[PDB]
């Protein structure tokens, strides 16, 4: 099973010039519990912004071009990189926008953040048809001093 986190502002902007405006430590804390020992995939851009390699999980980059870094696997197709992970039982996407779209048609849950934030970014995340998803799970907290916006953590399953 195939499955999307992110972090959505208004207007489900992800993000803005390759870069989260936002502080939410309660957010890193919710992706890292969701993501762990748990194979990612990600896009080119988004592997440029982390940087290194996530631990505790088998990073997964798609990019058509080889790759220029051995610690991590290089793919360069959407099936190429699902047969990558294995026999898991959850396959985590982290993003960006680009990958989500195409990961979107196969996944089974999407993890989301809803942030109460006003952002201006370049990227959104897919427009999905609410009929085909359900909501399995909520928690709304307000901003605390940790945390400067309100934010809720959704989990949605395919129908
Ligand atoms: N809010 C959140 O939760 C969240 C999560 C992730 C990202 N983001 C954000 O999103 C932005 C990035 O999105 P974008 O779109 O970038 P992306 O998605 O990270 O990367 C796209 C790149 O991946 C490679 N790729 C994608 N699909 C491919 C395929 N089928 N075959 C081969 N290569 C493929 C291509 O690289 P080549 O050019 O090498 O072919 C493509 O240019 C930032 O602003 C960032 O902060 C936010
Ligand atoms: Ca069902």
Same mark, same amino acid.
């Given at each position: 099973? !195939?499955?999307? !986190?992110?972090?959505?502002?208004?207007?489900?902007? !992800?993000?803005? +010039? $390759?870069?989260? *405006?936002? $502080?939410? #430590?309660?957010?890193?804390?919710? @992706? =890292?519990? $969701?993501?762990?020992?748990? /194979?990612?995939?990600?896009?080119?851009?988004?592997?440029?912004?982390?940087?290194? *390699?996530? *631990?505790?999980?088998? $990073?997964?980059?798609?990019?058509?071009? *080889?790759?220029?870094?051995?610690?991590?696997?290089?793919? =360069?197709?959407?099936? +190429?990189?699902?047969?990558?992970?294995?026999?898991? #039982?959850?396959?985590?996407?982290?993003?960006?926008?680009?990958?989500?779209?195409?990961?979107? /048609? =196969?996944?089974? =849950?999407?993890?989301?953040?809803?942030?109460?934030?006003?952002?201006?970014?370049?990227?959104?995340? #897919?427009?999905?048809? #609410?009929?085909?998803?359900?909501?399995? @799970?909520?928690? @709304?907290?307000?901003?605390?001093?940790?945390?400067?916006?309100?934010?809720? @953590?959704? !989990?949605?399953?395919?129908?």
């Amino acid at each position: 099973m !195939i499955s999307l !986190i992110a972090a959505l502002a208004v207007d489900r902007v !992800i993000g803005m +010039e $390759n870069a989260m *405006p936002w $502080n939410l #430590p309660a957010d890193l804390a919710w @992706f =890292k519990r $969701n993501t762990l020992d748990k /194979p990612v995939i990600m896009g080119r851009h988004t592997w440029e912004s982390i940087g290194r *390699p996530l *631990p505790g999980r088998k $990073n997964i980059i798609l990019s058509s071009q *080889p790759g220029t870094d051995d610690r991590v696997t290089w793919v =360069k197709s959407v099936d +190429e990189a699902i047969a990558a992970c294995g026999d898991v #039982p959850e396959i985590m996407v982290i993003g960006g926008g680009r990958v989500y779209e195409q990961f979107l /048609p =196969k996944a089974q =849950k999407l993890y989301l953040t809803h942030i109460d934030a006003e952002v201006e970014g370049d990227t959104h995340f #897919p427009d999905y048809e #609410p009929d085909d998803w359900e909501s399995v @799970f909520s928690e @709304f907290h307000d901003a605390d001093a940790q945390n400067s916006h309100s934010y809720c @953590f959704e !989990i949605l399953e395919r129908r």
